[PDB]
Design a binder for this molecule. Structure first.
Ligand SMILES: Nc1ncnc2c1ncn2[C@@H]1O[C@H](COP(=O)(O)OP(=O)(O)O)[C@@H](O)[C@H]1O
Ligand SMILES: Nc1ncnc2c1ncn2[C@@H]1O[C@H](COP(=O)(O)O)[C@@H](O)[C@H]1O
Length: 214
């Protein structure tokens, strides 16, 4: 089972990415996570991303499509995967079509622009695993520590009001058009489209997803 998460920044795609992963098995492919790992481990394929990311700008299609093509490669993704943060553009979406990468479901996480700044300013992550918390809306069992390894949590470098603003716009310019893209795919029968209310409580969106899938 292949799946795509599609939504504004802070819409809770990642938070939902974890669940589907542990409950269905399929690995979670988060471009942003890979970019941040690579940027930190100084990998050759990704380290370049650094300045762009911290600016709020999207990274060049070519670099990202590569990474994804390299990760889907792994044998863990032979039974399905979860593209969480990709595609982010028509080119990127197009590139997947030619490569013959079909998805079973496309899930649009609907969340208002006004809700975004506050979700994001209070988001903390366990970088090593990408596990994502929120100091108020979905905190850790122990303040400042990852629930599975007890490791200190951190705040993302690009998680600041200003950068979130720049981030929202690009979303509206480049990514947003994709809702239309997959709507059309869904209409042709190529995929299954599903919008869900991302303002609801985590535990609740979780159940909506479970209704949509199985
Ligand atoms: N459904 C929700 N309601 C309230 N807060 C949420 C919800 N889902 C996620 N969050 C919190 O919002 C922040 C951003 O969500 P995240 O899952 O990181 O989304 P995205 O991956 O789309 O940016 C995190 O701090 C997260 O714990
Ligand atoms: N699929 C992508 N296409 C282009 N840029 C991306 C992509 N995914 C992640 N990035 C970069 O990763 C950063 C953080 O994305 P995220 O962690 O998914 O919110 C963005 O600010 C972009 O610069």
């Amino acid at each position: 089972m292949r799946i795509i998460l599609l939504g504004a920044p802070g819409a809770g795609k990642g938070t939902q990415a974890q669940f589907i992963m542990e409950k269905y098995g399929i690995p979670q492919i988060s471009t942003g996570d890979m970019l941040r790992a690579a940027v930190k481990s100084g990998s050759e394929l990704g380290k370049q991303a650094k300045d762009i990311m911290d600016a709020g700008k999207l990274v060049t299609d070519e670099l990202v499509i590569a990474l994804v093509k390299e990760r889907i490669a792994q044998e863990d993704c032979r039974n399905g995967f979860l593209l969480d943060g990709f595609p982010r553009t028509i080119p990127q979406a197009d590139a997947m079509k030619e490569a013959g990468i079909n998805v079973d479901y496309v899930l649009e996480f609907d969340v208002p622009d006004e809700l975004i700044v506050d979700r994001i300013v209070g988001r903390r992550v366990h970088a090593p695993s990408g596990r994502v918390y929120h100091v108020k809306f979905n905190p850790p069992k122990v303040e400042g520590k990852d629930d599975v390894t007890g490791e200190e949590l951190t705040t993302r470098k690009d998680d600041q009001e200003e950068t979130v603003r720049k981030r929202l716009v690009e979303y509206h310019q480049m990514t947003a058009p994709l809702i239309g893209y997959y709507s059309k795919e869904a209409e042709a029968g190529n995929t299954k489209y599903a919008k869900v209310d991302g303002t609801k409580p985590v535990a609740e969106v979780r159940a909506d997803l479970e209704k949509i899938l199985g």
